[PDB]
């Protein structure tokens, strides 16, 4: 299920999306995030993404809506894996993850990053391969 440490972690994850700290994620904020991860959703796509997680229909995502979403195919996971595996070599390194997190406006110690890698890593080689990435999601 769901620990207070995880709720804490999802609460800081939400802050990566909620750029202005006003407590909601707007279509504009989501667009910014998505472009920082190399994507280019239209205005209507961003509204679609918002409206799917927007439980109360108010046009923005609050933390309870975000947390709910987080409580919970081939191509989407592969597509996401390629966002992190910047050099295409099949392995997410700590430095590739560092880079992704810095693009999202998040300066992390080399230790924090290594724990993220460590938690996803299954075989212990210090990197995240595609099969390990698939498992993390599921």
């Amino acid at each position: 299920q769901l620990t207070e440490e995880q709720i804490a972690e999802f609460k800081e994850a939400f802050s990566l999306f909620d750029k202005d700290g006003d407590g909601t994620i707007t279509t504009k904020e989501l667009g910014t995030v998505m472009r920082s991860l190399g994507q280019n959703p239209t205005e209507a796509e961003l509204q679609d993404m918002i409206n799917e997680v927007d439980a109360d229909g108010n046009g923005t995502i609050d933390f309870p809506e975000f947390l709910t979403m987080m409580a919970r195919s081939e191509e989407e996971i592969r597509e996401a894996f390629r966002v992190f595996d910047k050099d295409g070599n099949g392995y997410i390194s700590a430095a590739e993850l560092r880079h992704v997190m810095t693009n999202l406006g998040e300066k992390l110690t080399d230790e924090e990053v290594d724990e993220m890698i460590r938690e996803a890593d299954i075989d212990g080689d210090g990197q995240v391969n595609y099969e390990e990435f698939v498992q993390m999601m599921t």
Binding site: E12, M49, M69, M116
Partner: peptide, 22 residues
Amino acid sequence: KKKATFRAITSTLASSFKRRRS
């Protein structure tokens, strides 16, 4: 950190791809 951040970014990416048009 751990999987929650990693998963959060990953799940939003999934959203992108599951929601595209033409």
